Amino acid sequence: DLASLAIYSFWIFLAGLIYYLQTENMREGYPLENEDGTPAANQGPFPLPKPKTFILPHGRGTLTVPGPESEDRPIALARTAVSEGFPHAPTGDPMKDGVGPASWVARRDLPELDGHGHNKIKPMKAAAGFHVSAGKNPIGLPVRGCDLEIAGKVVDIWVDIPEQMARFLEVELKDGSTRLLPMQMVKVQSNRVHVNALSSDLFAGIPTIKSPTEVTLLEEDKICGYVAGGLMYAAPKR
Amino acid sequence: YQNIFSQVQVRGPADLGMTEDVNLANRSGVGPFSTLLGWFGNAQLGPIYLGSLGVLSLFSGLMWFFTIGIWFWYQAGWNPAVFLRDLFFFSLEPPAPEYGLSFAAPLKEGGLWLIASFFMFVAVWSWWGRTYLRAQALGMGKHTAWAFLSAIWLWMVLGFIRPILMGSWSEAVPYGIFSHLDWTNNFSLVHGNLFYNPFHGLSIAFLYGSALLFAMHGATILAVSRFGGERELEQIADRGTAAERAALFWRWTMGFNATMEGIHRWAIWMAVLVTLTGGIGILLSGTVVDNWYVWGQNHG
Amino acid sequence: ALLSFERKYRVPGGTLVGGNLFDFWVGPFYVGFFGVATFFFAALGIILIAWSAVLQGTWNPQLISVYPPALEYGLGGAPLAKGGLWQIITICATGAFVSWALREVEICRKLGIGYHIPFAFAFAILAYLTLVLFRPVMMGAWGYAFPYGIWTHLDWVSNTGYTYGNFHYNPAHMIAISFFFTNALALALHGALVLSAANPEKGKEMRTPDHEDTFFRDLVGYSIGTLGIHRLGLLLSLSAVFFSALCMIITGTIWFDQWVDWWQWWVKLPWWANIPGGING
Numbered sequence: 001d002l003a004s005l006a007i008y009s010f011w012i013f014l015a016g017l018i019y020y021l022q023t024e025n026m027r028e029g030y031p032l033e034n035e036d037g038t039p040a041a042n043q044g045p046f047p048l049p050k051p052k053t054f055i056l057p058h059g060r061g062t063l064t065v066p067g068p069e070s071e072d073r074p075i076a077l078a079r080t081a082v083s084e085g086f087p088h089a090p091t092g093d094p095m096k097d098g099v100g101p102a103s104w105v106a107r108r109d110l111p112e113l114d115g116h117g118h119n120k121i122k123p124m125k126a127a128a129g130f131h132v133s134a135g136k137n138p139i140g141l142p143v144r145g146c147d148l149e150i151a152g153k154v155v156d157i158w159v160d161i162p163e164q165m166a167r168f169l170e171v172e173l174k175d176g177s178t179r180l181l182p183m184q185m186v187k188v189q190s191n192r193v194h195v196n197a198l199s200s201d202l203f204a205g206i207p208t209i210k211s212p213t214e215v216t217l218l219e220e221d222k223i224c225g226y227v228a229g230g231l232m233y234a235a236p237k238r
Numbered sequence: 239y240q241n242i243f244s245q246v247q248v249r250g251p252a253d254l255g256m257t258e259d260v261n262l263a264n265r266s267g268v269g270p271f272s273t274l275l276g277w278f279g280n281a282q283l284g285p286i287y288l289g290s291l292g293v294l295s296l297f298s299g300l301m302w303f304f305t306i307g308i309w310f311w312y313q314a315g316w317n318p319a320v321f322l323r324d325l326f327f328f329s330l331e332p333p334a335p336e337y338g339l340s341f342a343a344p345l346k347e348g349g350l351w352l353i354a355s356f357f358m359f360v361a362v363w364s365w366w367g368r369t370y371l372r373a374q375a376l377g378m379g380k381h382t383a384w385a386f387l388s389a390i391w392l393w394m395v396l397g398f399i400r401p402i403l404m405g406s407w408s409e410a411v412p413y414g415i416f417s418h419l420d421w422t423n424n425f426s427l428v429h430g431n432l433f434y435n436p437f438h439g440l441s442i443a444f445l446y447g448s449a450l451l452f453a454m455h456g457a458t459i460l461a462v463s464r465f466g467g468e469r470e471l472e473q474i475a476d477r478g479t480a481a482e483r484a485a486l487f488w489r490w491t492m493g494f495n496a497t498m499e500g501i502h503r504w505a506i507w508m509a510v511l512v513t514l515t516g517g518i519g520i521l522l523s524g525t526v527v528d529n530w531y532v533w534g535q536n537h538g
Numbered sequence: 539a540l541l542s543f544e545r546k547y548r549v550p551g552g553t554l555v556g557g558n559l560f561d562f563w564v565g566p567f568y569v570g571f572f573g574v575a576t577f578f579f580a581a582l583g584i585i586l587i588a589w590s591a592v593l594q595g596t597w598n599p600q601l602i603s604v605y606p607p608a609l610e611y612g613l614g615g616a617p618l619a620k621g622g623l624w625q626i627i628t629i630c631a632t633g634a635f636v637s638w639a640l641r642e643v644e645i646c647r648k649l650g651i652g653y654h655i656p657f658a659f660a661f662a663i664l665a666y667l668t669l670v671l672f673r674p675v676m677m678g679a680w681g682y683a684f685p686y687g688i689w690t691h692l693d694w695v696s697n698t699g700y701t702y703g704n705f706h707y708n709p710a711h712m713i714a715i716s717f718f719f720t721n722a723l724a725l726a727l728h729g730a731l732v733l734s735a736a737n738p739e740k741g742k743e744m745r746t747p748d749h750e751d752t753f754f755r756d757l758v759g760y761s762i763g764t765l766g767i768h769r770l771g772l773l774l775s776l777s778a779v780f781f782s783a784l785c786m787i788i789t790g791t792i793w794f795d796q797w798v799d800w801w802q803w804w805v806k807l808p809w810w811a812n813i814p815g816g817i818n819g
């Protein structure tokens with residue numbers, strides 16, 4: 001009967017859809033590797049899909065996935081055991097080396113562009129006429145780290161122009177240079193900005209940007225990586 | 239800090255948006271900015287695009303709504319105290335089984351149901367056309383229109399396709415708050431309990447799965463928002479530590495993972511399969527299977 | 539084996555219990571203390587369900603059903619054959635689910651991400667504990683809990699619902715359904731939008747978030763934005779389950795009559811209770 005034919009058909013369709021969906025989710029990070037970077041013997045039952053090519057806007061070229069995968073950076077880790085599946089210990093300073101929760105990816109060293117090909121993220125001082133419209137304005141507040149010591153002062157907000165939101169606080173340190181802190185890792189209070197992730201002595205080590213009025217995808221990844229790594233690595237001084 | 243609500247709002251000039259091949263003559267101007275909305279999402283209201291299809295859908299949609307409303311007022315003996323008291327109990331019912339698929343039923347006994355339904359039919363389909371055309375004008379894929387078609391399938395089956403195959407409009411759903419719940423309950427009893435309909439069971443699994451998946455996906459993107467996770471398109475074009483930590487959370491938890499693009503393929507399908515399997519389950523009820531208990535006993 | 543990018547993240551630390559003892563992986567799976575707790579709770583639970591299948595005299599997964607104690611046991615222990623296995627399996631299931639949550643927290647800490655996922659999962663656990671622990675205890679017997687079997691638990695949904703007439707009329711049930719339906723609508727739109735931007739018309743450049751904002755303003759006059767839709771999805775789906783738990787915690791406890799009759803509070807308000815015409819008079 002028709003209902004029997006329909007339910008049987010539906011289960012065959014669904015098995016094909018799951019096959020299609022799983023192969024689509026293998027366009028990054030595959031093939032699988034041994035801890036030494038060599039291709040693993042066992043890849044599982046699903047094959048790599050045929051490559052697709054994204055045409056990136058604003059003349060920034062193409063991306064073909066799957067494609068050749070490398071970290072394009074040195075990984076300061078060593079094995080802690082003689083067999084697979086144990087942790088890899090940092091060989092230096094995991095915050096400086098960018099491993100564990102302080103990891104960053106070698107994204108393009110260009111800033112994200114909006115739909116008109118202008119920089120997505122600008123300091124508010126250079127964004128006509130963006131202003132704080134609601135909530136406490138953090139500009140001028142001292143910044144305190146998890147050691148309850150003052151590390152600097154907020155001197156601007158970096159804004160996403162197309163989405164009209166705050167992405168970083170620009171902080172001025174004791175020595176007059178600035179750092180970006182991601183908005184999602186600070187608490188704005190009436191009389192201060194508080195940073196759980198970092199102690200005061202770790203603010204100077206936040207990676208610097210190379211232009212004062214733009215931030216690149218690579219730089220965002222180094223800054224956000226570094227600040228998140230403080231949750232684990234600044235924990236002796238919280 | 240959890241990133242459920244913004245700590246600071248910023249505002250700049252109203253965003254009139256991208257042009258591409260859009261006819262700007264048919265865009266309104268920006269509406270006001272809502273500080274309230276701005277704690278959770280965007281403050282900007284408008285602009286909206288209103289071409290000929292937009293006006294047709296909006297007028298038609300209001301005629302469907304007003305047609306039900308005038309019938310509710312009639313039923314309330316034009317008394318605003320009764321209208322409010324009995325609001326959930328009013329019902330515009332379809333024509334009786336006697337009139338079959340005929341458009342000849344008097345207003346007070348199902349003619350008004352057919353008029354409201356006609357208006358609803360124009361409203362929904364013109365709105366479908368609008369989701370396709372607004373995507374075309376911006377050069378985007380038609381994902382939204384194909385996904386909407388899945389909702390339209392279940393609606394089309396309940397009110398149109400199934401009533402036609404059964405040979406009467408009496409089989410269609412009445413316009414009323416409590417009356418459409420009674421119809422839903424009644425439908426299950428008459429067809430020997432829908433829990434035995436395997437398509438109804440799959441629909442539930444996908445409805446469930448949609449809540450599981452958006453809980454997972456929403457939580458995941460907020461957990462990696464400290465590395466710019468919500469910027470999903472640029473993370474597709476150039477994988478960052480946000481996409482890597484998101485993948486590895488799930489790999490380490492349950493043994494497999496998604497890409498930043500691929501999670502949206504899981505998302506669109508989990509959702510469309512709700513109304514897809516649902517519409518099939520309803521289409522087969524009373525047309526092919528009188529009783530799901532009985533069918534289940536023969537597995538066939 | 540590892541994803542191409544995985545090794546830099548497999549560092550020591552982030553454990554809540556046992557320091558470095560369980561700080562390792564088995565294939566892709568992270569272990570931790572709460573991985574060991576999950577296996578123990580899950581394994582003991584599966585054995586007990588097998589031992590239940592024996593006493594019932596069936597190995598068919600479509601017939602195996604583990605029933606709570608009968609009502610006359612109230613909130614006491616029961617013999618294994620008559621509800622005791624259910625009681626122990628329920629402690630094992632609660633043990634496995636809480637352990638799974640705390641294991642998600644350990645993975646969060648190693649990866650330096652927020653705790654939103656195990657927070658969200660805790661809402662599923664609360665719905666489960668509502669049906670098997672909170673409602674039964676408030677009602678005064680384990681017997682009001684649902685049985686563990688594929689078809690017998692649907693039988694319980696049907697019998698529990700119809701005890702109160704058409705269960706549609708539970709107002710907390712109405713709100714819960716509204717969130718479930720809205721969440722699925724929102725998930726379809728979110729998936730469709732991102733895919734429509736990443737995968738535009740053949741030969742065109744990838745669209746921008748600005749295209750996604752513009753699409754929705756053109757269509758309905760509002761865009762909630764890329765951060766907003768992820769906030770929305772978390773909120774719709776946690777709300778659906780919150781109102782689900784609420785609709786059952788009030789059923790058989792503060793309200794135990796037909797749900798349809800509850801709506802008489804509205805109709806019998808004195809300023810329109812006695813006005814002729816309409817449906818109610």
Ligand code: BCL
Pocket residue numbers: 433438439440442443444446447450584587666669684688689691692695
């Ligand atoms: C939620 C309100 C009701 C309820 C009312 C209904 C109704 C109505 C239906 C179901 C249906 C199902 N219910 Mg139920 N169900 C309830 C509580 C549960 C609980 C629990 C709280 O522990 C579980 C594990 C289940 C599990 C199930 C599945 C067998 C099935 C599809 C679920 C799904 O796709 O979800 C979404 C989740 C996913 C897509 C992720 C995958 C989850 C997998 C599929 C679960 C497998 C569970 C396994 C068989 C249990 C044994 C495993 C042990 C380790 C041995 N229900 C309560 C009592 N349930 C449907 C069915 O078809 O029943 C036959 C159906 O129509």
Ligand code: BCL
Pocket residue numbers: 361362389390392393396421422423424425426431432433437438441442445512513515516517519520695719722
């Ligand atoms: C006593 C009641 C019966 C029962 C009888 C039915 C009947 C009858 C049906 C379902 C259907 C469903 N049931 Mg059931 N169901 C029962 C018990 C359950 C239980 C449970 C016990 O826990 C659950 C979880 C469900 C869950 C479900 C869903 C999976 C499914 C509806 C999917 C959907 O999203 O439609 C909601 C979405 C739509 C209806 C699409 C609408 C699209 C249109 C285009 C929107 C127009 C909008 C309009 C213009 C207004 C504009 C508004 C303004 C602009 C704001 N049922 C019991 C056994 N159930 C449906 C189904 O598919 O069955 C297989 C269905 O027809």
Ligand code: BCL
Pocket residue numbers: 422635662663664665666668669694695696698699700704705706711714715718779781782783784785786
């Ligand atoms: C005739 C039946 C009645 C009815 C009687 C009831 C009764 C009785 C109940 C509901 C409940 C619900 N009803 Mg009702 N309901 C009816 C008709 C409907 C219709 C419809 C369209 O007609 C809809 C859409 C609904 C929808 C709903 C939801 C609001 C709710 C179920 C979701 C939930 O609680 O998730 C919560 C999720 C869970 C409980 C899952 C928890 C998962 C746990 C934490 C993890 C499991 C892990 C697993 C074992 C692992 C598997 C192994 C792995 C795969 C490896 N009902 C009709 C009128 N309804 C239920 C409710 O609100 O419960 C609180 C409920 O008890």
Ligand SMILES: CC[C@H]1c2cc3[nH]c4c(c3C)C(=O)[C@H](C(=O)OC)c4c3nc(cc4[nH]c(cc(n2)[C@@H]1C)c(C(C)=O)c4C)[C@@H](C)[C@@H]3CCC(=O)OC/C=C(\C)CCC[C@H](C)CCC[C@H](C)CCCC(C)C
Pocket residue numbers: 446447449450453454457491492576579580581583584627630631634635638642655656658659661662685686687688691775776779
């Ligand atoms: C709160 C919103 C939604 C939600 C969220 C949610 N669920 C989650 C998560 C989140 C955020 C996870 O992180 C977690 C996960 O890992 O997802 C892949 C999970 C999860 N949600 C799951 C299931 C699930 N979620 C559901 C629902 C929902 N989860 C909500 C709709 C449902 C429904 C609707 O029924 C189910 C079935 C799992 C896939 C997973 C949790 C897995 C877990 O805890 O593993 C440890 C335990 C075992 C390996 C099994 C132990 C077995 C027992 C000891 C014995 C059996 C007892 C049981 C009572 C049998 C009853 C069976 C009968 C009823 C048929």
Ligand SMILES: COC(C)(C)C/C=C/C(C)=C/C=C/C(C)=C/C=C/C(C)=C/C=C\C=C(C)\C=C\C=C(/C)CC/C=C(\C)CCC=C(C)C
Pocket residue numbers: 303304306307308310352355356358359393394395396397398411412413414415418
């Ligand atoms: C206060 O007063 C004012 C003026 C504001 C008016 C008030 C209005 C009010 C209070 C309105 C309330 C309306 C309500 C509560 C509506 C509820 C509707 C519900 C619950 C709908 C549920 C389901 C509907 C379905 C399934 C409809 C399906 C319809 C179709 C598929 C269309 C079928 C078309 C047909 C039969 C005609 C086709 C004809 C031709 C020629 C093609």
Ligand SMILES: CCCCCCCCCCCC[N+](C)(C)[O-]
Pocket residue numbers: 018022043044045046493494
């Ligand atoms: C509820 C449906 C979701 C489950 C679908 C099954 C997907 C399993 C894929 C395993 C991938 C393993 N591997 C080696 C490729 O990483």
Ligand SMILES: CCCCCCCCCCCC[N+](C)(C)[O-]
Pocket residue numbers: 135243244245246274275277278
């Ligand atoms: C769902 C859309 C509307 C949501 C509006 C909710 C407003 C929340 C207000 C938060 C208060 C501001 N604060 C103190 C968190 O910065």
Ligand SMILES: CCCCCCCCCCCC[N+](C)(C)[O-]
Pocket residue numbers: 266267268269270283284285286758759760
């Ligand atoms: C989802 C509800 C949001 C609706 C917002 C629509 C805003 C309309 C803008 C009105 C401005 C009209 N005009 C001609 C003065 O520019």
Ligand SMILES: CCCCCCCCCCCC[N+](C)(C)[O-]
Pocket residue numbers: 018436437438439440443447504507508
């Ligand atoms: C996107 C695909 C996700 C796969 C989810 C599959 C859930 C299985 C549901 C089993 C219910 C089967 N039943 C009894 C209704 O025939």
Ligand SMILES: CCCCCCCCCCCC[N+](C)(C)[O-]
Pocket residue numbers: 044492493494565566
């Ligand atoms: C019926 C739904 C249950 C489906 C559960 C499947 C879980 C997939 C686990 C993937 C792990 C594969 N592995 C071990 C090769 O990595």
Ligand SMILES: [Cl-]
Pocket residue numbers: 776777780
């Ligand atoms: Cl809540």
Ligand SMILES: [Fe+3]
Pocket residue numbers: 455459470728732768
């Ligand atoms: Fe997303």
